[PDB]
Design a protein around this ligand. Structure first.
Ligand SMILES: Nc1ncnc2c1ncn2[C@@H]1O[C@H](COP(=O)(O)OP(=O)(O)OP(O)(O)=S)[C@@H](O)[C@H]1O
Ligand SMILES: Nc1ncnc2c1ncn2[C@@H]1O[C@H](COP(=O)(O)OP(=O)(O)OP(O)(O)=S)[C@@H](O)[C@H]1O
Lengths: 198, 107, 380, 163, 239, 228, 370, 278
């Protein structure tokens, strides 16, 4: 949204195709099309769909996935280097991948994502609640201090379910108890089990 | 991985500078029946003629494999494409000055 | 030689009757339109790679033959002949006529519902919280955007369902479809079970490409266990095609300019073995579940399954609802139909509460305790 | 005949020595040769092979890597499996009934004796089952005595102590 | 959760080998037992004489004392060990308190041993179910049965082995109030049970009696032929 | 998985104890109600055959002269526990010339209700109701296979315990009387049973401080049945 | 002596079966049809008198319909008649009567009717009022307004008459019958079970009201094969597709689904619940009295002397079946042709009795128990 | 006719003529098999099982009238069991030869499945080739093959058409195949296969050696008592490699010492003791 380079997206399973060898065609033509528009930012989504710790076995094995991955790697790095490609990849898990997918600088800057500790929770609540009309009798720091270990989407669910919990009344703008009951839906994972622990 | 297995052959590709047919060995198979076998025949004829040729096939394990108990059908033509190399690297007509440089991620 | 005679010469009289009958035997609707349609045109359809600049100069592969530089006929809309747009092309002149909507799939267009089953919210009694929250999610923003946008809040795109087998996931899903006012789409979770690699990716593709064109539509997933439980890793390469199908479903579900105006209702009978990538909200917000009918909702299900039958008025409903705490509405339906069948075993026309006694004391004993058989005390 | 075994036991090498010391016509056949771009070349190629085999002589053909042809499993919807299937059928129907007298000798050779249809290893088709096993202590001594005769060999270096 | 082992439950609260070990009894030979008012009598079926050997060693009805009588089902070896232990238990009880051994105490012993044998680590439970008949307290006829779980369970008549539901169902339609005594009617009751047996071959019937005061008496295959003859006479008189 | 007593769950818990609590459910029901006049108690026998002699199946046994019991589940684990309590009560009277109170009885039973161990066997499969009169009046006591013992005022067990507890909390309050609680209990019994209530189906066990001996009702229970 | 009428009627039947212009408008429609009337396949239908077809190799055209045969006959996924000259859609072709129909759609009411039972007359009445009365006389569902019961389960010992009752409902029938053996639902590919489920029950749903009978369905949960790709994480997918197929959506139709098992314990509790299956039906080995009815029926058309009592074959064995009694009859016939007699005597029954009880019911080598 | 080539013109697509010599599909599957074609004169050394399978197969074929006269149900599945090499396949082939029934061996191939239908969904198009080729004897080898046999026998028992449709499976290890399969109203005549005894090995030797070029002067019972029990096709190997032993000494006559070497050649099947234990 902010930068204005030739930006390019890519999903994981969109690469592997029913026939044998079409992923090589697809990734090679993708690199060509991005290279002919040199300020090129390639976005990769779910690399772990095609990134796999490969295996030697018998009687079974799914091969062409590693063929498309080796296409990606070799046309990415090594012989015939390029200077104008920019890569952004995003996975949800890590150790599925080959070490030759990274190693140091197949992808260079290894960047993890932390979860909101305490303060960024109230920050994210403020961000998504910026559009709603609030009767501002709300300490968001209370809410960030009670909701432990949520993501941004769970705080968004808090925000929207608080809006429609206020709309259960339907009369007016947001109250603090609207946020409380939004939490009380987003919280659990309900247990309530309880037994043998006296 | 990352020991510069590529760049050593690339340094040879900046030392002899003769006929480096650096096959990436992943963009060979496209979709068809016997096209890859014909490309292998073409490379071996071309290497036979231009007498100082250097064969280089990076990331072999995609096209190599080992063997199967006959699972996915495309693996049949994979193994035939590999047995193309298995025959015509040795055959009966022995190659001459056909030096093959090979690199892998897991051998 | 009685029945032998009978069969033999009766079939012989039949055959001899047939022999003399085998011997005794010896438009303007649209035709002129069709002769006017021999001056019609063959109109082979094709596919477009790309245009050129300042001039059409269209580059087309048919589907199979080759690739050609062609030019349009002058009877086209000279704008809407864009890339990937399947168009009809002349045989001889290779000139283009009209774009038509593309290949959808050979058998994925065949899962739009194309009807509306008469399952009604009134038949799904005992889950009034589930009824009202499902109302709030699905029925309200898609028909009456009155309160959501006018304050500036969003409707939730995602809702999950599970519960005891026999509770009304089927009922709620079919019950929306009476009052859908939307392009409801059925998806079995086993539809992604194909032979060929990466085909479920194409399935998710054509699902959402049917979703995007027509606006304000419903897509119903069902039994999403087969879509995949987790992201298992082992040295043998097991659940992979299912896994990539699952992740592609996550991506073309939501992310990087997401879905738009689609509501997806998901159901399963084993939600605990689901990956967190589906479980994280935004993808699915309200995790609405089902419980057992614990109270006079049971009696309301009795009233549903009894209001369509002429009964004895001298009956109660809460007594048998006491006698079925753990039971499901499917088991309630079986008991009500079974008692009606007991009344049809009799030559009456109106049942008894004792017919309900027969149904209870026959089903819950014979087919909730003889499967499996006990032949041992050990307990009592 | 059929050759197999641990691969690297000179399976090609006996065919080498036979072809050098044969007399009649000798055809080598690439096992992967038959699957080619034209849709139908294979049966005509097998007919070329066997018509020439009956045509010449009581001659010898050596077909190595027949595992490229011999694969027991197929899938009759891909299309590419069906030509391999009919290449096997073309081979089968022209194997049992040559002439019973035209002594064509087709030496088949793989390394893997797993992916072979039991309809191939039949009496009349391939009677003998011959492996090339790994050598032992004295065969390696004899192999060393053969191979080391070409190098100049500083003659007080014993190689039996590495066997 | 699985058929191994004996130690863990099912997820719905069962023991597989406890439930499965009764099937070895349920596929076993049939042996019935009733109580009279004064004379108690029982018997096994399927003598199965295989024409070339003796059968005095295969006797499935024995005694621990002069006051108690045995029967079993399932496999024979567990019955051998349990009875050989129970004799020593009866005699150790006699070495203690000088009463004739009550049927209730020895059934508690056998079922208790069987249960604490089952609870232990990897011991295959005795797949038998014994019939323990005695009349001790002023000649009060008692018969208890056992279980592979080890539950003594007092009856008035009993039927185990193959097809025990049908054989017990005959005693449901047979056992009115005025059975005994009337010892002759108890005799004919045992005879009608043997006629209602799953095969009722006529010569494979082996029955033993106790008049609550005497010893165990093994009968003779001519008295039983007279019993089958008078039972067929009663069937003809029903016509 | 869960495969044995020596392995927790990722969330809790046993996962052997849970299957023992599940193995409570198979048994026949029983109901006891604590009343300050005295503890009343009831059970179902679930007779199979007419040959099955009804007074032979034990449900209420006598541990002490003022302490009753009722069993729910596996018969023989219950018999072992009754045996141990019968030993231990007598040892307490031996070493103290007094009656072991029923809470201390239950602590003694629940000392090895969970001492389950195969090395260094399985946990037991019965839940038990204890009724008795200590110095503080009558006591009604409810334990479990897991040894988590607590007092209950009117506990119901076994099969159909849910609606039993429901209709029990419907009818119960603190100041009940004796025969009212007796008929209130047997109403719930004939609501949860499948057979016609008669003299052979159920049995009562009534202990009172002035009527300590004979915690049983024999065929006057017929007269109690016919009053409904 | 009945061979004469048999052969003559058979030949007359064959010859009369082999016994199979004025209209000018019909000939003009013939002349609107080509002489090489080619054949194609549809993709989509457009209302403007022409639609899109596909050729054999994959050429596709906008070609119009000869409109005397209706376009409502045309559905996506049909084989049509095409021209050569403008390739116009000529008419409707009769469909590919695929080997699923020729294998599964049994046209034949197989064998003896409800007079071939043993120990029945309640379960007959159950399957009658649960299938036939919804089929033949559903006027009582008008009279009350209640759903018919849906699913039927036959379970008991092997040789009880699961096969016999399956042939009985297919005997008295007026609907299309389908039959599947439950061991077929695993193939040597990944994902072939759900395709079988969908095409099977689509063909079941397309023709008419019908009856689907599947037998030995327990052979999918407790069976493993080396001839299996994937495995349990494809067996579960097969089960889950059949799960959605049976208790799914969209007014499933008048297709009575009847199942039959030997064992019952290893089955999904989600598949024996009602909604799917409303009439579970016990098959016990019924009684020692209708042993005589099966001896009566299975010897109703064979000459036999008196010479025996069936009570001798009642007091021999404790478990009873038609698999017992028919084996007794066949082995008695083997002993009859062994001793070249008719009017079967007692010694054939005795040796047949002993040899059939031994082969097979004993268990296991001595001993054990005894 | 169904599936017949005809001469079709190319311009107007008019029928020209009928083309002969259509397909030969069962012949094609037969040539996929190449079973040892047999007759009675070669399975000597035993005639009991031959008479059993005569009584159970030739008698349904030659005389359906004798079965249908007394009104009995004819047998339809004969399970055979025994060790390999005792003529588990020569037997059924000689039976089907001396009754002229269409012999069928559906073993395990995609060749087979592609020639039944197109390997489409199941095997029950063999029933199409069973009824239409009504003298049908089907043969199977040694848990999937049994599953296919279970499908076949679950339809052909009384829920199908005119007989002479009988299947034959000959294997070992009788208990691993199903017991519901061995329901007595499903499989009748379980016929054992013996190891070849001394005179039986003698007769096998006389058959597999009679057609060769012997030395003038030979004995056979000594050779028959050398073997402690071979298979059927081991004695053939004995004879042919004794002929090889004759030809390596540049002779065409086969003495006894060729057999003395061939017995030792086949003897490497079993040796190896310090294994008596047992
Ligand atoms: N509350 C209810 N009221 C009325 N009918 C009900 C109710 N609950 C269940 N049913 C009946 O039970 C069936 C409902 O479908 P379900 O069995 O719930 O399908 P399902 O929820 O998808 O279960 P699965 O497929 O095992 S996850 C129909 O027969 C309904 O008539
Ligand atoms: N007995 C031997 N005496 C001398 N040299 C031998 C001997 N055995 C093997 N060799 C040498 O080792 C080589 C054996 O390999 P090849 O003959 O190439 O067999 P092959 O082609 O490798 O068959 P493979 O292993 O399936 S590719 C020969 O070329 C010889 O140089």
């Amino acid at each position: 949204a902010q930068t204005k380079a030739t930006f390019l997206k890519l999903a994981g399973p969109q690469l592997v195709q029913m026939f044998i060898g079409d992923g090589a065609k697809l990734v090679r033509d993708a690199f060509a099309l991005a290279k002919e528009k040199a300020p090129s930012i390639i976005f990769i989504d779910e690399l772990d769909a095609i990134g796999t710790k490969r295996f030697d076995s018998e009687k079974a094995g799914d091969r062409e996935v590693q063929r498309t991955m080796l296409e990606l790697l070799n046309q990415l790095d090594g012989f015939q280097p390029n200077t104008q490609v920019k890569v952004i990849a995003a996975t949800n898990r890590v150790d599925i991948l080959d070490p030759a997918l990274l190693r140091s600088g197949r992808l260079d800057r290894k960047i993890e994502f932390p979860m909101p500790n305490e303060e960024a929770r109230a920050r994210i609540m403020q961000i998504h609640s910026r559009k709603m009309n609030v009767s501002p009798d709300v300490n968001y720091e209370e809410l960030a201090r009670c909701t432990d270990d949520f993501n941004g989407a769970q705080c968004k669910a808090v925000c929207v379910e608080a809006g429609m919990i206020a709309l259960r009344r339907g009369a007016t703008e947001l109250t603090h108890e609207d946020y409380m009951e939004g939490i009380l839906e987003v919280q659990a994972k309900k247990k309530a089990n309880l037994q043998y622990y006296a | 991985p990352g020991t510069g297995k590529t760049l050593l052959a690339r340094a040879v590709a900046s030392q002899l500078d003769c006929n480096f047919l650096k096959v990436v060995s992943s963009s060979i198979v496209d979709k068809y029946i016997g096209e890859s076998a014909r490309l292998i025949r073409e490379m071996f004829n071309y290497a036979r003629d231009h007498q100082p040729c250097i064969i280089f096939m990076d990331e072999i394990d995609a096209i190599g494999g080992r063997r199967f108990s006959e699972g996915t059908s495309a693996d049949r033509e994979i193994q035939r494409t590999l047995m193309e190399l298995l025959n015509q690297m040795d055959g009966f007509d022995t190659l001459h000055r056909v030096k093959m440089i090979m690199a892998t991620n897991r051998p | 030689q009685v029945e032998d005679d009978i069969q033999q010469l009766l079939k012989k009289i039949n055959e001899l009757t047939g022999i003399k009958e085998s011997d005794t035997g010896l438009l303007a609707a649209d035709k002129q339109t069709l002769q006017s349609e021999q001056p019609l045109q063959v109109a082979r359809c094709t596919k477009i790679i790309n245009a050129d600049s300042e001039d059409p100069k269209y580059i087309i592969n048919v589907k199979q033959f080759a690739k050609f530089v062609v030019d349009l006929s002058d009877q086209v809309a000279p704008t809407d002949i864009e890339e990937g747009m399947r168009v009809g092309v002349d045989r001889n002149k290779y000139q283009i006529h009209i774009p038509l909507p593309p290949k959808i799939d050979p058998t994925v267009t065949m899962m739009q519902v194309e009807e509306k089953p008469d399952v009604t919210y009134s038949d799904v009694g005992g889950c009034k919280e589930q009824i009202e929250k499902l109302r709030e999610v699905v029925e309200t923003p898609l028909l009456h955007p009155e309160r959501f946008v006018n304050l500036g809040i969003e409707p939730p795109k995602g809702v999950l369902l599970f519960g005891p087998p026999g509770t009304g996931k089927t009922l709620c899903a079919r019950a929306v479809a009476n009052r859908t006012d939307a392009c409801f789409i059925r998806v079995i979770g086993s539809e992604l079970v194909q032979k060929y690699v990466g085909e479920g990716a194409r399935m998710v593709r054509e699902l959402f490409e049917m979703a995007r064109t027509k606006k304000a539509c419903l897509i119903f997933f069902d039994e999403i266990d087969a879509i995949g439980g987790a992201r298992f890793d082992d040295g043998a390469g097991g659940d992979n095609e299912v896994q990539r199908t699952m992740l592609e479903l996550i991506n073309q579900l939501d992310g990087f300019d997401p879905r738009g105006n689609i509501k997806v209702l998901m159901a399963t009978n084993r939600p605990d073995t689901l990956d967190p990538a589906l479980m994280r909200p935004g993808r699915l917000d309200r995790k609405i579940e089902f419980s057992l009918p614990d109270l006079e909702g049971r009696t309301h299900i009795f009233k549903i399954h009894a209001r369509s039958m002429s009964v004895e008025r001298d009956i109660r409903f809460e007594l048998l609802a006491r006698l079925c705490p753990n039971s499901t509405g499917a088991e309630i339906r079986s008991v009500c139909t079974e008692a009606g069948m007991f009344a049809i075993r009799a030559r009456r026309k109106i049942a008894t509460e004792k017919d309900f006694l027969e149904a209870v004391n026959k089903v819950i004993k014979s087919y909730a305790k003889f499967s499996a058989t006990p032949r041992y005390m050990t307990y009592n | 005949v059929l050759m197999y075994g641990p691969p690297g036991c000179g399976k090609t090498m006996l065919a080498k020595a036979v072809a050098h010391h044969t007399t009649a016509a000798f055809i080598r056949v690439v096992g992967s040769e038959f699957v080619q771009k034209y849709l139908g070349e294979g049966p005509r190629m097998v007919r070329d092979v066997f018509r020439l085999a009956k045509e010449n002589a009581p001659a010898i053909i050596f077909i190595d890597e027949i595992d490229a042809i011999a694969t027991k499993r197929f899938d009759a919807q891909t299309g590419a499996d069906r030509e391999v299937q009919r290449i096997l059928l073309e081979l089968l129907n022209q194997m049992d009934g040559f002439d019973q007298n035209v002594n064509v000798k087709v030496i088949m050779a793989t390394n893997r004796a797993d992916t072979l249809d039991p309809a191939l290893l039949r009496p009349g088709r391939l009677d003998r089952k011959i492996e090339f096993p790994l050598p032992d202590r004295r065969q390696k001594r004899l192999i060393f005595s053969t191979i080391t005769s070409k190098m100049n060999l500083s003659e007080e270096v014993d190689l039996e102590d590495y066997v | 959760s699985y058929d191994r082992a004996i130690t863990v439950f099912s997820p719905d609260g069962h023991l597989f080998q406890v439930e499965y070990a009764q099937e070895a009894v349920k596929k076993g030979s049939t042996a019935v037992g009733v109580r009279g008012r004064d004379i108690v009598v029982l018997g096994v079926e399927k003598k199965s004489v295989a024409k070339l050997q003796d059968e005095r060693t295969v006797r499935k009805i024995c005694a621990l004392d002069d006051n108690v009588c045995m029967a079993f089902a399932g496999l024979t070896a567990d019955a051998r060990i349990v009875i050989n232990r129970a004799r020593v238990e009866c005699q150790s009880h006699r070495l203690t308190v000088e009463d004739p051994v009550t049927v209730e105490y020895i059934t508690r012993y056998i079922a208790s041993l069987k249960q604490r044998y089952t609870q232990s680590n990897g011991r295959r439970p005795f797949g038998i179910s014994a019939l323990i008949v005695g009349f001790d307290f002023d000649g009060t006829p008692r018969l208890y049965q056992t279980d592979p779980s080890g539950t003594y369970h007092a009856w008035k008549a009993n039927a185990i082995g193959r097809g025990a539901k049908s054989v017990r169902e005959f005693l449901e339609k047979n056992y009115t109030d005025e059975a005994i005594e009337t010892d002759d009617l108890t005799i004919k009751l045992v005879i009608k049970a043997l006629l209602e047996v799953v095969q009722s071959g006529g010569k494979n019937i082996e029955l033993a009696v106790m008049r609550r005061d005497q010893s165990l008496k093994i009968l003779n295959p001519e008295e039983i032929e007279k019993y089958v003859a008078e039972i067929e006479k009663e069937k003809e008189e029903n016509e | 998985y869960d495969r044995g007593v020596n392995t927790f769950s990722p969330e809790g818990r046993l996962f052997q104890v849970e299957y023992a609590i599940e193995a409570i459910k198979l048994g026949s029901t029983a109901i006891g109600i604590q009343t300050s006049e005295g503890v009343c108690l009831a059970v179902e026998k679930r007779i199979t055959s007419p040959l099955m002699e009804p007074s032979s199946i034990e449900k209420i046994v006598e541990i002490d002269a003022h302490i009753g019991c009722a069993m729910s589940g596996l018969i023989a684990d219950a018999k072992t526990l009754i045996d141990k309590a019968r030993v231990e009560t007598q040892n307490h009277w031996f070493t103290y010339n007094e009656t072991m109170t029923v809470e201390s009885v239950t602590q003694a039973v629940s000392n090895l209700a969970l001492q389950f161990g195969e090395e260094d066997s399985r946990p037991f499969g019965v839940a038990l109701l204890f009724g008795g009169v200590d110095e503080k009046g009558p006591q009604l006591f409810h334990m479990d296979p897991s040894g988590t013992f607590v007092q209950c005022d009117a506990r119901a067990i076994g099969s159909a315990s849910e609606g039993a507890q429901s209709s029990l909390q419907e009818v119960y309050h603190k100041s009940m009387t004796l025969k009212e609680a007796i008929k209130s209990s047997l109403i719930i019994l004939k609501q949860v049973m499948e057979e016609k209530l008669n003299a052979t189906n159920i049995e009562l066990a009534t202990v009172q401080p002035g009527q300590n001996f004979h915690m049983f009702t024999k065929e006057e229970l017929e007269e109690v049945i016919k009053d409904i | 002596l009945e061979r004469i009428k048999d052969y003559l009627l058979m030949e007359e039947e064959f010859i009369r079966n082999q016994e199979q212009k004025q209209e000018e408008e019909r000939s003009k429609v013939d002349d609107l049809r080509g002489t090489p009337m080619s054949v194609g396949t549809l993709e989509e239908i457009i209302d403007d008198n022409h639609a899109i077809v596909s050729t054999s190799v994959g050429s596709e055209h906008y070609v119009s319909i000869l409109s005397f045969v209706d376009k409502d006959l045309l559905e996506p996924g049909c084989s049509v008649l095409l021209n050569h000259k403008v390739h116009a859609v000529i008419g409707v072709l009769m469909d590919d009567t695929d080997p699923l129909v020729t294998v599964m759609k049994v046209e034949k009411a197989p064998q003896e009717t409800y007079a071939d039972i043993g120990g029945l007359d309640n379960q007959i009445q159950e399957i009658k009022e649960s299938v036939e009365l919804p089929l033949t006389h559903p006027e009582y569902y008008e009279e009350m307004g209640i759903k018919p019961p849906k699913g039927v389960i036959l379970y008991g010992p092997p040789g009880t008459g699961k096969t016999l009752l399956a042939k009985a409902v297919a005997n008295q029938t007026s609907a299309t019958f389908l039959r599947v053996v439950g061991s077929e639902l695993i193939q040597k590919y990944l994902g072939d079970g759900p395709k079988l489920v969908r095409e099977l029950f689509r063909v079941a749903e397309e023709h008419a009201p019908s009856i689907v009978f599947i037998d030995e369905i327990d052979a999918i949960g407790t069976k493993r094969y080396d001839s299996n790709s994937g495995g349990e994480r494809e067996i579960q997918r097969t089960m889950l597709e059949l799960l959605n197929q049976l208790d799914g959506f969209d007014s499933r139709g008048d297709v009575k689904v009847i199942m039959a098992t030997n064992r019952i314990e290893t089955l999904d509790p989600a598949l024996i619940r009602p909604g799917r299956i409303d009439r579970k039906i016990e098959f016990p080995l019924p009684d020692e009295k209708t042993k005589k009815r099966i001896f009566q029926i299975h010897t109703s058309r064979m000459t036999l002397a008196d010479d025996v009592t069936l009570d001798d074959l009642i007091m021999a064995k404790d478990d009873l079946s038609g698999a017992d009694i028919k084996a007794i009859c066949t082995e008695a016939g083997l002993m009859a042709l062994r001793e070249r007699r008719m009017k079967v005597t007692n010694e054939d029954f005795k040796k047949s009795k002993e040899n059939v009880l031994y082969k097979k019911q004993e268990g296991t080598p001595e001993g054990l128990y005894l | 006719t169904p599936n017949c080539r005809v001469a079709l013109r190319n311009d107007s697509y008019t029928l020209h003529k009928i083309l002969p010599n259509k397909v030969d599909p069962l012949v094609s599957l037969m040539m996929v098999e190449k079973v040892p074609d047999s007759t009675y004169e070669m399975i000597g050394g035993l005639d009991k099982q031959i008479k059993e399978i005569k009584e159970v197969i030739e008698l349904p074929v030659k005389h359906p009238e004798l079965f249908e006269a007394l009104g009995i149900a004819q047998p339809k599945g004969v399970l055979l069991y025994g060790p390999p090499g005792t003529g588990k396949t020569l037997l059924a082939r000689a039976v089907a030869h001396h009754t002229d029934c269409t012999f069928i061996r559906v073993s395990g191939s995609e060749l087979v499945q592609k020639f039944i239908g197109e390997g489409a969904r199941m095997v029950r198009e063999l029933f199409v080739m069973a009824r239409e080729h009504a003298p049908s004897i089907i043969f199977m080898d040694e848990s999937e093959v049994q599953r296919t046999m279970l499908e076949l026998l679950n339809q052909l028992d009384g829920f199908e058409a005119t007989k002479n449709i009988k299947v034959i499976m000959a294997t070992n290890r009788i208990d691993i195949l199903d017991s519901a399969l061995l329901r007595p109203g499903r499989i009748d005549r379980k016929i054992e296969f013996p190891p070849p005894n001394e005179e039986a090995r003698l007769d096998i030797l006389k058959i597999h050696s009679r057609k060769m070029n012997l030395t003038r002067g030979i004995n056979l019972r000594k050779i028959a008592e050398l073997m402690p029990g071979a298979s059927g096709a081991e004695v053939k190997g004995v004879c042919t490699e004794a002929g090889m032993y004759a030809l390596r000494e540049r002779r065409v006559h086969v003495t006894q010492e060729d057999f003395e070497m061939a017995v030792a050649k086949v003897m490497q099947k079993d040796s190896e003791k310090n294994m008596s234990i047992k």
